[PDB]
Design a protein around this ligand. Structure first.
Ligand SMILES: CCCCCCCCCCCCCCCCCC(=O)OC[C@H](COP(=O)([O-])OCC(O)COP(=O)([O-])OC[C@@H](COC(=O)CCCCCCCCCCCCCCCCC)OC(=O)CCCCCCCCCCCCCCCCC)OC(=O)CCCCCCCCCCCCCCCCC
Ligand SMILES: CCCCCCCCCCCCCCCCCC(=O)OC[C@H](COP(=O)([O-])OCC(O)COP(=O)([O-])OC[C@@H](COC(=O)CCCCCCCCCCCCCCCCC)OC(=O)CCCCCCCCCCCCCCCCC)OC(=O)CCCCCCCCCCCCCCCCC
Ligand SMILES: CCCCCCCCCCCCCCCC(=O)OC[C@H]1O[C@H](O[C@@H]2[C@H](O)[C@@H](O)[C@H](O)[C@@H](O[C@H]3O[C@H](CO)[C@@H](O)[C@H](O)[C@@H]3O)[C@@H]2OP(=O)(O)OC[C@@H](COC(=O)CCCCCCCC[C@H](C)CCCCCCCCCCC)OC(=O)CCCCCCCCCC)[C@@H](O)[C@@H](O)[C@@H]1O
Ligand code: HAS
Ligand code: HAS
Ligand SMILES: CCCCCCCCCCCCCCCCCC(=O)OC[C@H](COP(=O)(O)OCCN)OC(=O)CCCCCCCCCCCCCCCCC
Ligand SMILES: CCCCCCCCCCCCCCCCCC(=O)OC[C@H](COP(=O)(O)O)OC(=O)CCCCCCCCCCCCCCCCC
Ligand SMILES: CCCCCCCCCCCCCCCCCC(=O)OC[C@H](CO)OC(=O)CCCCCCCCCCCCCCCCC
Ligand SMILES: CC(C)=CCC/C(C)=C/C=C/C(C)=C/C=C/C(C)=C/C=C/C=C(C)/C=C/C=C(C)/C=C/C=C(\C)CCC=C(C)C
Ligand SMILES: [Ca+2]
Ligand SMILES: [Cu+2]
Ligand SMILES: [Mn+2]
Lengths: 57, 100, 143, 63, 129, 216, 574
């Protein structure tokens, strides 16, 4: 069988399809980060690290 | 979806309902041919008008006849196709008893 | 997308009929104050204008036979029907201005016809287009 | 009613000042400036008429 | 929102991190020096006067800008009413919430109107009681 | 791969001959352009004369002095003498970066005025118009550069604050049951119990502005 | 139909602050990276009016030179360049950009979408249009000046032989850069209407304005790339040694046919959207719905369909075209325009007309365009066109139609949507002053040019003899032309003052009776245009939202002799 990128959303072809040249499950463009995601997420789950910093006086 | 539901005393705007005539391709194609038909009227007028001042003497009968032929085929085509596109609306009007 | 897929059939058939009428007319009518003979400019334009509208109409119809009964087209739809994700939209981007400037540089290059301006313009143009298309997929800073 | 009288009258002499100068100078560059003076007079005339129009039929009732 | 070295954080968000506000007197001084230099430009050996037109237009616009920056005039906010617009003390009702709840501006509609919006009055009699 | 200074077709020097395009090297074009834009002011004093080229010497010397002594004229107006070790992002210091872009446009106008003989020949702008563009531009263009640069820097740091107080705008737009169009924002710091980010204090470090810069 | 339960302690959302309160640097970087349809549309509009003033200054110079015989301050070359560039900038840098600016602001609000389909493409369209404008205007910096061959650029005059100098080339690129900017704007408006419509907004519940924009989008996509191909062909002939537009190849009539095939749909592209704007303005201030709605839609689509067959009526004096065919088609294209006029006066019939500023502008537009089109019909017949063609009669005709359809109606649109675009209302008195100045100055300038056109003065004439016999008429034209120039002072001051200190708008529809959907939301709208979507059920969402008690009347009195279909039985079940 063919390979599938794990970022690909799961679906059952027997009752639909994921995307074609003609139709899609969205009115606008699909999310670059995956329509299957659910934003927002937690601060630590973001991976960002806010810097505390001070400067001389 | 799949069916409408109106209570008594409610009148909607009829357009783009599943029974509407604007939603089907025959109607629009008929509009195109109906617009095309007036070109034949122009053609026959051009033929007889050129005749009125003694010009186009060698071909004016052919131009008039072909103009009338094109006009009649186009206008009858447009009318028939429009009526075909409106047939679902007539069936709906028979079904429900509401015009809009 | 049912109504707009099918309303395009009027303009295209009218343009096609005008194209054939005009080709026969100019190739046959030897009227004074004009010269007999088929003219290709105008006839080609009419047929390919019919082509443009026919391409639009046929693609839209070919697509619309696939789609479902969308709530925007349902004459008695409720605001709750379309709840969910509408889609992804670009928040902001500097690259449209950049590639407009690149096209401007290329256009000025062909104005004076300095070959280096044309080459640098094309290079800058494909660079800016690439940066536009990769905006929301540039990799995270690799440590 | 209102300023429209004076704003018309101030214009009516300026316009008169313009056309007179136009019929004084020959075909020259200063004829252009005469035309400008004449048109400025006409503009102040219409300006008076428009403030009169606003006063006759106000549509921003509360000042 | 604090003021750092004369400038407010609301006008300059990074007011505390660097050099932000030039004194208006400095702007005036630089502008007038520039105007003096550009008026001096027209004492060279050039013959034509198209140069003069450009210089005089730009210096006139410079002086206009510098005068308005010197005084910084203002106008008042006009308190007129144009149309069905309402004065500042108005409170705008959420017409959509009223439509979806039959409350507020959509409350107390008669039976005929409720039928006219495809809503049977039987489901609404207690709500209007 | 590129020829530079093809001396073999210039011929040897003799003081009676010259070419139309005879500018010095690129890094000297600024001091050529100064000599091109000076309006010929010359002083005569009895048995003596100050030529018109003394003033470009004064101007270029002032220009060099300003560059040489900059940190101290920065001190006297900035009002600080601290022992800084962390750098300023140029957006956070709009006055200095605006003055820098102002000096850049000044230097570039001097450069292109130095090269205007070639510029007018190639791009078909009148040679007198180029000299007057240099003259009037060395006053006007610096001011425009300062204005635009200052406002752009303020806008940049405003975008930074907007992200830090509202989170990244993903670009995912969703419609609520009420029909309101909302864009889900992805917070960086913690969120209040009302369900909205708590603002972070700006720190001078770059703020991420998109979700592809968080790994997503 | 569902009715929701009440919410505990509900409060309406915080509507955004009005304009003029912006801080320092709050729009610079926002502008440079903008992909918001509405801010982008505002800057579209401002840039287009900047080009309007720039072109009109050249127009006033032309009039000042033609005030009296003899060349007072212009030469022949400078006069030629002036009318060429005036025509080019006013048609391509003012008209089409203002059309797309109003489209970009208004259309997503009317169709109930948050944003346009392709935001970055829209920003690219704006910036490339401005790039083309500056390229087009750069020709004046040339020592020899800009292009000098009229805005049509007939060949062989545009050949390398007969038009040297780089300004002639810069025109070609400035036009082309503008053309693709227009195309990039059109790609959105089709795809947006096809894909981002609000729930319940079927295609025939759209406002008339967006219908016109839809038809104009398809029309513009037809015809702008043809201009680009022809223009690149001309540049190919010029810079290289091409021969395609050589007269011995038939290049003159080739260029005329191709250009006018582009060009007549351009004037209809300018025409239809402003017809739509007045079709939105007139129902509001007459308190009456639009008369013959789907009829107007069919008329708009008929104009779109007929525009592609009418093109060669610009060549009746060339001796090449087939006269009867094109004369008949350009007679046919008059019918739907007259249908639109009849519909406007019909919706005004026995209405309650209030005369706030946009209604004044709309009726002025109707009065002007009536005579403009009435003149156009006379130009449509060949035997009259043999004398009229390329005279000042033609000048007066197309200035009537353009100045009516663009300037009057664009001003109407500005006054109409200034609340929705700013959150403030324009000064009424300055508006009336502006209107009367423009109206009287216009009719003074251009009504008398019919007579000089008839008497024998051709277009594009830089100098004329004292013995010719049409100096007084030109003098009368010139004075009122300077009045037209003075007319825009109150407009600029009014916009400037109202932006920064104008009357604040509280309600969602300061005019009161807004029918279209954009009048249901806030003034200004939020970033994504809608804090809540009304129940859309007709061509008047905002009206039926704000006046529920009117609905039973609005559905009942719509049709003459309306049927008994209200009494029909129930049709289904939930
Ligand atoms: C009476 C006249 C005015 C007055 O009070 O003068 C005395 C008064 C005495 O100081 P003060 O009373 O504290 O007031 C100072 C400011 O006027 C108070 O206002 P301020 O502090 O806001 O104004 C400061 C301003 C005051 O000064 C001025 O306005 C200038 C005159 O100075 C500057 O803005 C700095 C100018 C720096 C110029 C050099 C920049 C170099 C950039 C290098 C970039 C890199 C280029 C590389 C090379 C190229 C390659 C690309 O001002 C002066 O002496 C200076 C102006 C004369
Ligand atoms: C190319 C520009 C590249 C970037 C240059 C840059 O960064 O400049 C920043 C610098 C100012 O940046 P900023 O401090 O962030 O500006 C915000 C204002 O301080 C404060 O905000 P603001 O609300 O004052 O925004 C500026 C502007 C509003 O923003 C703009 O005007 C932007 C224009 C952009 C397109 C370019 C036009 C040329 O409003 C005004 O200045 C007052 C009203 C102006 C209207 C009067 C003139 C009308 C002429 C045309 C006739 C009217 C037609 C009908 C219009 C109806 C509209 C509802 O200059 C500009 O933005 C120039 C544009
Ligand atoms: C946009 C607006 C554009 C206006 C139209 C373009 C044309 C510009 C124009 O109107 O020029 C006048 C025309 O004469 C020019 O030479 C001048 C005399 O006329 C001429 O007889 C003399 O022969 C010249 O004298 C010497 O010079 C010659 C070579 O120049 C040598 O043979 C010989 O040495 C000779 O003795 C004399 O030269 P100046 O340089 O002194 O005068 C240029 C200047 C004169 O006008 C003014 O002062 C107007 C004052 C108002 C300022 C504002 O006109 C201009 O440029 C400026 C015109 C102003 C237009 C602005 C309108 C505002 C629009 C808003 C944006 C010549 O250039 C002709 O080509 C030209 O058509
Ligand atoms: C926005 C810009 C424009 C609009 C709109 C416009 C409308 C029309 N024009 Fe035009 N025009 C021409 C014909 C028409 C016709 C038939 C209409 C139509 O839109 C007019 C219809 C409008 C109406 C408002 C109709 C009347 C209304 C009612 C309600 C009654 C219905 C009609 C009836 C009953 C018939 C009339 C009855 C009679 C008894 C006469 C022709 C040729 O037939 C030429 C080329 C001539 C030449 O030789 O160069 C031309 C030239 C131009 C140019 C030339 C530029 C150049 O040469 O460089 C421009 C820019 C321009 C713009 C515009 N024009 N036009
Ligand atoms: C949308 C389309 C058009 C509009 C609008 C338009 C407006 C005017 N036209 Fe026109 N035009 C003529 C006169 C006028 C006048 C007096 C105005 C008026 O609207 C102009 C007044 C309006 C203004 C608006 C200018 C006032 C400017 C002021 C008061 C101040 C300027 C200074 C600043 C600083 C501006 C403020 C700047 C800021 C950034 C705020 C004449 C004859 O009197 C001819 C034929 C001449 C010949 O011999 O061929 C002509 C030729 C044409 C052609 C054919 C060109 C060709 O054959 O190649 C076209 C397509 C055309 C279109 C248009 N035209 N015009
Ligand atoms: C310049 C001189 C003319 C100045 C206008 C004088 C007439 C006037 O004030 O008209 C007011 C009128 C508004 O309508 P209304 O208040 O009903 O007045 C008519 C019935 N009394 O005003 C209007 O209806 C003006 C509407 C535009 C008319 C354009 C005609 C072309
Ligand atoms: C790996 C890379 C190749 C690029 C073009 C080379 C030039 C060329 O082709 O010339 C012949 C070419 C002649 O045409 P051609 O032979 O037909 O291509 O030159 C020109 O046409 C352009 C003339 C340019 C004039 C420039 C004037 C001086 C500009 C100074 C700019 C200084 C910027 C300072 C910035 C400081 C901060 C960094
Ligand atoms: C730094 C450049 C200073 C140039 C001084 C020229 C004085 C002169 O040689 O002035 C002499 C000259 C005569 O003066 C003029 O042109 C009057 C204008 C001089 C410059 C005013 C600024
Ligand atoms: C060798 C080496 C080592 C290096 C290289 C070379 C060099 C040395 C160089 C150097 C350079 C420099 C340092 C430079 C500098 C510069 C500067 C600082 C400059 C400055 C300038 C200034 C000016 C001109 C100013 C101006 C101003 C004005 C004009 C103002 C105005 C104002 C107003 C009008 C107000 C209002 C506003 C508006 C309109 C915008
Ligand atoms: Ca003259
Ligand atoms: Cu036409
Ligand atoms: Mn001709």
């Amino acid at each position: 069988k063919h390979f599938v990128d794990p970022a690909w959303p799961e679906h059952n072809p027997a009752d639909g399809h994921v995307v074609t040249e003609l139709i899609s499950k969205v009115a606008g463009a699909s999310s670059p980060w995956g329509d299957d995601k659910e934003f927002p997420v937690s601060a630590e789950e973001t991976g960002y690290v806010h810097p505390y910093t001070r400067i001389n006086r | 979806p799949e069916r409408m539901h109106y209570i008594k005393g409610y009148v909607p705007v009829a357009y783009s309902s599943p029974h509407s005539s604007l939603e089907r391709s025959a109607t629009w194609l008929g509009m195109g041919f109906l617009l095309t038909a007036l070109a034949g009227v122009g053609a026959v007028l051009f033929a007889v008008g050129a005749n009125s001042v003694g010009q186009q003497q060698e071909h004016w009968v052919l131009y008039s006849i072909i103009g009338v032929v094109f006009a009649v085929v186009c206008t009858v085509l447009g009318t028939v196709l429009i009526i075909k596109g409106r047939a679902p609306y007539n069936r709906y009007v028979k079904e429900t008893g509401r015009t809009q | 997308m049912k109504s707009s897929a099918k309303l395009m059939y009027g303009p295209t058939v009218f343009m096609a009929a005008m194209a054939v009428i005009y080709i026969f007319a100019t190739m046959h009518v030897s009227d004074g104050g004009s010269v007999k003979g088929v003219e290709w400019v105008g006839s080609v334009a009419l047929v390919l204008s019919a082509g443009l509208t026919l391409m639009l109409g046929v693609y839209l119809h070919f697509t619309e036979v696939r789609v479902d009964v969308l709530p925007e087209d349902w004459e008695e739809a409720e605001v709750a029907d379309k709840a969910g994700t509408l889609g992804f939209f670009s928040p902001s981007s500097i690259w449209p201005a950049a590639m407009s400037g690149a096209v401007g540089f290329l256009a000025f290059g062909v104005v004076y016809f300095h070959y280096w301006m044309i080459a640098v313009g094309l290079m800058l143009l494909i660079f800016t287009i690439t940066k536009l298309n990769l905006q929301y997929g540039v990799p995270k800073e690799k440590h | 009613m209102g300023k429209s009288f004076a704003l018309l009258v101030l214009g009516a002499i300026i316009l008169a000042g313009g056309v007179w100068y136009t019929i004084e100078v020959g075909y020259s560059v200063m004829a252009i400036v005469a035309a400008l003076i004449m048109a400025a007079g006409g503009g102040i005339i219409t300006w008076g008429l428009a403030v009169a129009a606003d006063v006759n039929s106000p549509t921003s009732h509360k000042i | 929102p604090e003021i750092y070295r004369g400038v407010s954080t609301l006008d300059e968000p990074s007011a505390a991190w660097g050099w932000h506000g030039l004194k208006r007197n400095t702007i005036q001084l630089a502008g007038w020096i520039s105007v003096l230099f550009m008026l001096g430009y027209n004492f060279g050996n050039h013959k034509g006067h198209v140069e003069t037109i450009w210089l005089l237009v730009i210096t006139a616009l410079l002086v206009i800008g510098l005068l308005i920056h010197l005084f910084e005039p203002k106008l008042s906010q006009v308190r007129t009413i144009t149309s069905r617009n309402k004065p500042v003390g108005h409170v705008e009702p959420d017409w959509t919430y009223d439509q979806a709840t039959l409350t507020g501006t959509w409350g107390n509609l008669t039976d005929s109107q409720l039928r006219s919006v495809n809503i049977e009055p039987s489901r609404v009699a207690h709500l209007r009681a | 791969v590129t020829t530079i200074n093809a001396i073999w077709n210039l011929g040897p020097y003799n003081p009676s001959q010259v070419s139309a395009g005879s500018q010095p090297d690129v890094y000297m074009l600024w001091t050529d352009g100064a000599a091109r834009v000076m309006p010929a002011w010359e002083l005569y004093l009895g048995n003596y004369t100050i030529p018109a080229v003394f003033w470009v010497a004064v101007m270029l010397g002032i220009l060099v002095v300003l560059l040489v002594t900059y940190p101290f004229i920065e001190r006297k107006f900035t009002g600080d003498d601290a022992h800084h070790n962390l750098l300023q992002r140029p957006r956070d210091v709009p006055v200095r970066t605006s003055l820098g872009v102002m000096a850049l446009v000044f230097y570039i106008l001097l450069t292109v005025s130095g090269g205007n003989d070639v510029y007018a020949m190639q791009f078909h702008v009148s040679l007198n118009a180029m000299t007057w563009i240099g003259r009037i531009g060395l006053i006007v263009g610096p001011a425009i550069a300062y204005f635009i640069t200052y406002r752009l820097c303020i806008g940049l740091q405003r975008s930074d604050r907007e992200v830090l107080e509202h989170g990244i705008e993903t670009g995912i737009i969703k419609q609520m049951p009420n029909g309101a169009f909302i864009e889900v924002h992805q917070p960086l710091g913690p969120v209040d119990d009302h369900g909205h980010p708590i603002p972070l204090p700006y720190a001078g470090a770059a703020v991420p502005k998109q979700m592809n810069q968080l790994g997503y | 139909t569902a009715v929701a339960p009440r919410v505990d302690g509900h409060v309406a959302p915080q509507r955004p602050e009005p304009t003029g309160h912006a801080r320092k640097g709050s729009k610079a970087w926002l502008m440079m990276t903008t992909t918001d349809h509405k801010q982008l549309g505002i800057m579209y509009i401002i840039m287009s009016f900047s080009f309007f003033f720039l072109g009109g200054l050249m127009a006033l110079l032309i009039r000042a030179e033609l005030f009296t015989p003899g060349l007072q301050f212009l030469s022949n070359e400078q006069f030629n360049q002036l009318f060429t560039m005036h025509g080019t900038v006013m048609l391509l840098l003012y008209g089409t950009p203002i059309v797309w600016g109003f489209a970009n602001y208004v259309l997503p609000l009317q169709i109930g979408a948050p944003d346009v389909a392709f935001p970055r493409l829209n920003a690219f369209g704006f910036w490339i249009t401005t790039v083309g404008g500056v390229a087009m205007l750069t020709g004046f910096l040339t020592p020899g000046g800009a292009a000098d061959f009229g805005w049509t650029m007939y060949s062989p005059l545009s050949d390398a032989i007969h038009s040297p100098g780089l300004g002639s080339d810069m025109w070609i690129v400035g036009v082309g850069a503008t053309g693709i900017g227009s195309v990039a704007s059109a790609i959105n408006m089709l795809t947006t209407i096809l894909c981002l419509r609000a729930p319940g907004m079927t295609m025939f519940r759209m406002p008339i304005f967006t219908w016109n924009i839809f038809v104009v989008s398809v029309l513009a996509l037809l015809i702008f790339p043809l201009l680009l191909a022809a223009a690149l062909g001309v540049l190919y002939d010029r810079k290289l040694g091409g021969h395609l537009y050589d007269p011995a190849n038939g290049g003159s009539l080739l260029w005329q046919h191709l250009f006018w095939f582009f060009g007549h749909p351009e004037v209809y592209v300018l025409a239809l959207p402003f017809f739509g704007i007045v079709s939105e303005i007139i129902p509001v201030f007459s308190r009456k719905p639009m008369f013959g709605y789907v009829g107007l839609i069919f008329a708009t689509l008929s104009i779109g369909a007929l525009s592609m067959a009418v093109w060669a009526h610009h060549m009746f004096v060339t001796g090449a075209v087939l006269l009867p065919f094109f004369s008949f088609m350009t007679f046919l294209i008059s019918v739907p325009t007259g249908v639109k006029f009849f519909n406007w006066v019909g919706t005004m019939w026995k209405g309650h007309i209030t005369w706030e500023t946009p209604m004044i502008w709309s009726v002025g537009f109707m009065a002007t365009f009536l005579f403009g089109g009435l003149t156009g019909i006379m130009l449509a017949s060949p035997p009259l066109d043999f004398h009229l063609a390329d005279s000042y009669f033609l000048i007066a005709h197309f200035h009537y139609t353009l100045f009516g359809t663009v300037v009057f109606a664009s001003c109407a649109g500005v006054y109409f949507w200034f609340p929705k675009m700013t959150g403030r209302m324009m000064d009424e008195r300055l508006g009336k002053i502006h209107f009367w100045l423009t109206f009287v100055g216009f009719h003074g300038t251009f009504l008398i040019q019919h007579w000089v056109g008839n008497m024998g003065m051709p277009r594009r004439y830089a100098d004329y003899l004292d013995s010719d016999g049409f100096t007084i008429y030109n003098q009368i034209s010139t004075v009122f032309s300077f009045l037209l120039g003075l007319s825009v002072i109150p407009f600029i001051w009014n916009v400037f003052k109202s932006w920064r200190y104008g009357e604040l708008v509280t309600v969602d529809d300061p005019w009161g009776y807004g029918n279209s959907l954009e009048w249901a939301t806030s003034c200004p709208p939020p970033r994504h245009n809608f804090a809540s979507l009304p129940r859309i059920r007709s061509e008047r969402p905002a009206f039926e939202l704000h006046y529920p008690h009117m609905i039973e009347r609005m559905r009942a009195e719509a049709h003459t002799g309306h049927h008994d279909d209200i009494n029909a039985p129930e049709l289904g079940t939930a």
